[PDB]
Structure 1
Amino acid sequence: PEALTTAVDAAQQAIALADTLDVLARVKTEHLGDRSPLALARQALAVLPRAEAGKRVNAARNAAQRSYDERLATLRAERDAAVLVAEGIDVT
């Protein structure tokens, strides 16, 4: 269909709103999981008589994947950096 404003934009604001790996885990399965609306386009992408719509449908997931990947690595960096400071000891 045309879900460039209701599926990609609805996910890029819910991904950036998550500040926890647990919150981001729920947004994953709701906006990029197997039961996601963006997944429904590929599940029915072969019952279509591809060239003019495939690159436009794949670009909907290529943009939604970047938001999850750039947020996962960011929250992973914040989590890893915080464990190191919390594990500091007096070496003397």
Structure 2
Amino acid sequence: MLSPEALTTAVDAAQQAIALADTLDVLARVKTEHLGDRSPLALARQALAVLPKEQRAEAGKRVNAARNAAQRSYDERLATLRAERDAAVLVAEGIDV
């Protein structure tokens, strides 16, 4: 939760788990463990309060870019799965009305 090495590691761990999720239920689990309050990227923003005041502006900027990276990958993945779901409800759940 310090150097960009620790940030890029958590982003890649969050990004590959986001690309692995194929259902909306699985992506909800990834959102909890990689973007929720108990996620590595969230703990990095929590450690910005215990950092010296002269270092909050520099280190806090590197956290925002890393969080936006995993957040952007989540939104595009959520839209992709929602698009697939909307395009599959007609056939995969069709009934004789």
TM-score (norm 2): 0.80
Q: Which has the higher helix share?
A: 2
Deviation readout 1:65-87 (Å, 9 max, x if unpaired) = 01111000110011011113456
Cα deviation per residue 1:31-50 (whole Å; 9 max; x = unaligned)? 11111111101122122222
Which runs of structure 1 show a deviation greater than 2 angstroms over 4 or more consecutive aligned residues? 84-91
- RMSD over aligned Cα atoms: 2.1
What SS does the aligned partner of 1:2 have? helix
Residues in 2 aligned to 1:47 and 1:2: alpha-carbon distance in whole angstroms:
20
TM-score (norm 1): 0.84
* Whole-angstrom distance in 2 between the partners of 1:71 and 1:81: 15
Please state how far the C-alpha of 1:23 moved relative to its aligned partner: 1.1
How far 1:4 sits from its partner (Å)? 2.5
Q: Relative to 1, partners in 2 of residues 1:86 and 1:32: Cα closer, same or farther, differing over 3 Å? A: same
Equivalent residue pairs, number: 91
CA distance in 2, matches of 1:53, 1:85: 50
Unaligned runs of 5+ in 1: none
In 2, Cα distance between equivalents of 1:75 and 1:27 = 14
Gaps of 5+ in 2: none
